[PDB]
Symmetry: D3
Subunit: 231 residues, 6 copies
């Protein structure tokens, strides 16, 4: 029974969009699970096996309870029955209260393609007659949120991560192959000051909210507020 | 030091948009103040003096701590320096944490005109060199929300009012002259099943959120969520 | 030559979104046909064979002229050439003046997936060289509209159903397995006061329009008005 | 009891936005009245007295029943109580079923400023206690529409004017001082092929609708359709 | 190394949306390549072989350097890995600075389906580990623009084509089978004054910009302006 | 004949929104003039006379050719005929090719109120019969742009300021009273790391565009591009 299940297309997606929030939730003694849909086998830098090691270290730094690896294809997250079914299994295993996934308004098409698959899976996961690979019972997710990877958009709300910005930056620096040039690295948008740009975005959202750093989220489901109305 | 200050153009505006929420806040031992910008002197039904009595009874039913009467003109809420200054005084007296006002997308122009005046007043209230009628100190409101009177729009969030729907309906029935036909009443949009339409809207928003009844709100200021993310 | 062909993903979709409008059209002596894309085989309550009986009774209550059953998969309305072609056949058989389908902004992904298939089919149906399963001639639909199932959105227009609200409620009550708890029913969003929520929405749209009940529609095609400008 | 009352800021506004529609309505034996808010005294070409003659000829060409001249200031349509009251009088005299006014998304600020005044006047006109200059009874307008002058926007609906495009072009050519260069004319956006641009827009809207020419309109009030759903 | 690569679903798409711009670029001594995704085999008028001849003549009239023919299916531009890969090859062969494709808001679904495939291909083309059919190196497109075929929408920007409107009209008249009725033609939206409607749209966009004719474009990528800020 | 005239409500507005762009234009040997609508007499920090000195130093650092001081009231930028006329005079004196003003989506109401006045003034400035205080001839501004002060919104375009970011930061540091705490300063949103937040925003817009720093702008007038299409 995870409190949170956070999907990314590629390892490092969840950390870029909400690593400060994961670190915050783990410190509140929530159970947080991370699921990567792909092994990022088309990444310009690194290898599949090195990337897995880096992702395991990022998850340990944040205190995530489990890292689940799916093997859908990098640049191949086409809508299909079989891809949805694989994700339904993960949802029904973790029985999360809240699912997070990438926001679709992003230069990388895998981010929106991942969100479309995860939305179909959340619905199918709650239908008892829908059969997954492991024949697991129906599960109804209560909260569904979207985090930003490449975007800088006006979010529906923010979460204060002022106390976990260092844990987020450590989790990102775990992906040395992705963000840090080396003798054999090639130039990508990620190797040219990208962690400083994520920090700049979280500083701007923090300013909107009167704190040092905040992460932005969307919800398509209606938000119901209680303690946070007057705070 | 009010926790909440709720503005309307006319008495009954605040009750239609958020009477369930006021009743909820008062039961949480919050201090709630209501301010009507006008005496509703152009109301097709009733009189100024009868309307004041009805508004005092609605405020008592909800447990609001004080009802403040301004005398800006009904159908005359033109943007002016002097109208903004009158509202700044109310803000600086009550020192509210949260201000509520009408959402502007409404068939009645006074509702959007009231919101425009209250937005200018919230900003001017925080400027120490800005002088109000009573020479009061600067006050910075922390939360600013918009409630719906005539509209049915998709809100930014809802508040569960399932436990205070009866208190809301009692507060509305206090405005007998506005909602209940009599020997000398004239037809208005308010005298033809209007309280049942408010209840229908709050039932539909409750369905979006998985509760019996909820009230809808907007915020232009960024929402920062904490306990309500996972709830 | 049907005047109207109304598509749903599942039987009861068309009734929830526009059963009052179908009943209204049949009373105007229009020929109305209903097509369900799926047999709803993953429905939490009931069976495929019981659901068909209920759908035949709903169609009889509304006076629809024919109910067409397709066998695309429940939770499997992926965009495909073969799924579009199956729908093109139905369009070319019925030669409707107006096609109705679900609005895509809906918690159930099959509703938007159904609309995407029906949009592709309407275009392909008008292309003479496009071959359907029954080798039927090209047909150009004149009007294309979207109805709301789970949503409450601001529509492009409404239709007064004040005189057919009882026929709509009877058509919905025909789906006993879907809406009415029984000894062996499971909880769904449909078994917890859902017909009262549809009635509340149609009451709110009626208020916008000055009538008791109205159903909301969208059009992507430009509306051309004549008698209804001054009415 | 006019069927239609069409407001413009300046004479020629109503003709540019909806002269084909006025000509169509008059041929349907509707009573159409036109009201110009200003005498266009700051017009680069012509004079106040010449402009009035041209406006009287345009109204005669279209068959409008009366042309009402207000004297609010050109480039001075600031929101004021007294400007709203002057317009309320016109509404209460004509008792129109439908009011038309300029759409606000227009390079000329007087067009949106005129619409804002007319919206306030339509509401105040229906309030019996609101007193106009001539102490006239309350009047409730049923339909409220917006036409485009300088814009080319996607409208909410169109009206086929294929049969009245020549009457529209004659009404525009009545404003010789505005559209036709002369020995003493100065260059304006109106003197450089402007009637051909209005014709091009009405040709493009006609294409959207499958007719030769159509005029575009907006409505903020909900549209309720009946005969035009299936047409 | 093309300066420009313009994709259409069907030959004549690029000419309708941006033939004036292609003619303008060729006169500036830019290298312009055109790629048609389909052979338009379901076209109501003409044949595949006649259409190819007409497309070769249109390309010659505009001075395009090469016309590339893909064989994806007319009315079959479903998102697939293999369709994306075919387009990646064209991008990696031409190494364009700028890619143009259809805007998705269009009555013909192939136009949006083509844009979705081309967007996925532009991203995959820049990923070195992504393998195309011809094993070509990664290529990063710098500018990505959308042109309008059937639409008339408010664009993000326009390009003055006043000096190449005649070359555009000649390129369109090359498609005799598509636009000009004959003894054996059937009625389509294209055979009923369609070239005059394209000219009317370019006249309206020219008016917005103060020139005789202009073509409209969208960009999802951020525009960075320098010389055109002050022009 | 200024190339550029940039309006702010308060001195430091233009520098926050576009000081890098002004510095860039001056280095291109454009004539840039700055106009402040108010003397910022309600500023929590500093005095009117100190603020003028700081504004003169900021203008010198950027190389602006003239700084024009109007005396409209701080927190009193109500729409009025006389306020518009004062601004028309400045426009007709400077005869700018391009006018810049604040974007209206901003927590400070004076920023949107200033933009509304400047929009009315740009239109009235081009009307020869409209008389300003100095009886100056009509002037037609060619380009009209909006810059962001407090906002972080997705702009219509950016300008690369990578080479003038230091000049921008020097111009902002000239406003010591506004941004730098002192013995007698009070806390405002401007005294708590605000210049670092402006730099973070310009870093994020630079990332969208592939440069180090960029400033964001809006245009309501249609953009016509030529050299910047292919760049
Ligand atoms: O576009 C990028 O961000 C760089 C690009 O990396 C992104 O795209 C690759 C291809 O789908 C992925 O393998 C890689 O995981 C992805 N990175 C990513 O999304 N980080 O948030 C690269 O490796 O060239
Ligand atoms: O339009 C209506 O809702 C009816 C109308 O009442 C509204 O407008 C009047 C004129 O501004 C106001 O005096 C009256 O308070 C107002 N009612 C109202 O907004 N209730 O929420 C009436 O009395 O005729
Ligand atoms: O989510 C719901 O509305 C309940 C759900 O029913 C909807 O989803 C099922 C799975 O796709 C469908 O078989 C069923 O027809 C559908 N009902 C429906 O859309 N009614 O308008 C259920 O049976 O659990
Ligand atoms: O901007 C224009 O359309 C030209 C301009 O005419 C418009 O603006 C003037 C100043 O408000 C008005 O007197 C004139 O009536 C107005 N014309 C107009 O809106 N036609 O639809 C002019 O005379 O210079
Ligand atoms: O809808 C139309 O524009 C007419 C239609 O032509 C369009 O659709 C056909 C079917 O996909 C295509 O073969 C044909 O190329 C296409 N024309 C087109 O998009 N021109 O811009 C026809 O030939 O009937
Ligand atoms: O809200 C703020 O930015 C602080 C505030 O300063 C802004 O508001 C004051 C009142 O209108 C102005 O005098 C002051 O110029 C203004 N500053 C400003 O907009 N900087 O971009 C203050 O001095 O308290
Ligand atoms: Zn990724
Ligand atoms: Zn009210
Ligand atoms: Zn359904
Ligand atoms: Zn006008
Ligand atoms: Zn095409
Ligand atoms: Zn300012």
């Amino acid at each position: 029974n995870a409190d949170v299940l956070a999907f990314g297309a590629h390892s490092d997606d969840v950390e870029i969009g909400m690593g400060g929030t994961i670190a915050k939730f783990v410190k509140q003694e929530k159970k947080v699970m991370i699921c990567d849909l792909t092994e990022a086998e088309l990444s310009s830098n690194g290898t599949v096996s090195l990337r897995k090691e880096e992702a395991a270290e990022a998850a340990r730094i944040l205190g995530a309870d489990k890292r689940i690896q799916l093997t859908l294809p990098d640049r191949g997250l086409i809508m299909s029955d079989q891809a949805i079914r694989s994700i339904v299994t993960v949802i029904r295993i973790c029985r999360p209260k809240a699912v997070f996934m990438p926001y679709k308004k992003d230069r990388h098409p895998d981010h929106g393609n991942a969100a479309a698959l995860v939305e179909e899976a959340i619905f199918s996961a709650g239908i008892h007659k829908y059969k997954d690979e492991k024949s697991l019972p129906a599960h109804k997710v209560s909260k569904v949120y979207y985090y930003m990877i490449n975007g800088f958009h006006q979010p529906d709300f923010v979460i204060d991560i002022s106390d976990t910005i260092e844990a987020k930056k450590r989790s990102l620096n775990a992906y040395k192959s992705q963000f840090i040039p080396s003798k054999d690295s090639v130039s990508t948008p990620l190797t040219n000051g990208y962690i400083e740009i994520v920090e700049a975005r979280e500083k701007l959202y923090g300013k909107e909210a009167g704190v040092e750093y905040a992460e932005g989220f969307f919800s398509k489901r209606m938000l119901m507020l209680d303690h946070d109305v007057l705070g």
